[PDB]
Write a protein that binds this ligand. Structure first.
Ligand SMILES: [Mg+2]
Ligand SMILES: [Mg+2]
Ligand SMILES: [Mg+2]
Ligand SMILES: [Mg+2]
Ligand SMILES: [Mg+2]
Length: 117
RNA sequence: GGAUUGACAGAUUGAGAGCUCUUUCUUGAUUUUGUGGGUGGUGGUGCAUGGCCGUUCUUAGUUGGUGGAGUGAUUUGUCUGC
């Protein structure tokens, strides 16, 4: 669901849980750190997503949200001083949640559903 | 899918300075390059200034209010004496 994802990105931006990028994400997944991972499939040459999946096999669950630019936009990378987007382009293309922070019921039901697959 | 940061070892250096290079590794939006602007300056101007001190001047010297003399600038009061 769309709500739980923004909730978890807020709970990990507040307590510094987002591994904003792929090297930090890879290091977190290699360690016992990365508790969640959202990545976009609209990536050229597709090897980064394959590497993310392989590191995920190894901290298991992953999400497959598209729209890398939008993913970064609602991932909190923007300073977003105004109400509207005040930056030309900003993206993440991989986001890893380390610290779960505050917990909401809808989000935990969603992650349990995604774990069940 | 890296604005950037930092560095072992060597060349380089006076340096055990990752200053610069060889290679690579680390770091995460604080930054980096341009514009405006701002700071810092035992930089200049004491002949732009303050404050302070020095000196004229260690002497006894100044000043204005009513009043008098001058058209007036000024003067008397601030003096002949002791
Ligand atoms: Mg100075
Ligand atoms: Mg002077
Ligand atoms: Mg005097
Ligand atoms: Mg008179
Ligand atoms: Mg007189």
């Amino acid at each position: 669901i769309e709500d739980a994802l923004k909730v978890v990105l807020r709970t990990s931006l507040v307590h510094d849980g987002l591994a904003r990028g792929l090297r930090e994400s890879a290091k977190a997944l290699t360690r016992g750190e990365g508790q969640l991972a959202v990545l976009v499939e609209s990536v050229t040459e597709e090897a980064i997503s394959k590497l993310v999946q392989g590191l995920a096999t190894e901290n298991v669950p992953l999400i497959k949200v598209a729209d890398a630019k939008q993913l970064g936009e609602w991932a909190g990378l923007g300073k977003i001083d105004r109400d509207g987007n005040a930056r030309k382009v900003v993206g993440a293309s991989v986001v890893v949640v380390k610290n779960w922070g505050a917990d909401t019921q809808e989000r935990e039901i969603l992650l349990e559903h995604f774990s069940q697959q």
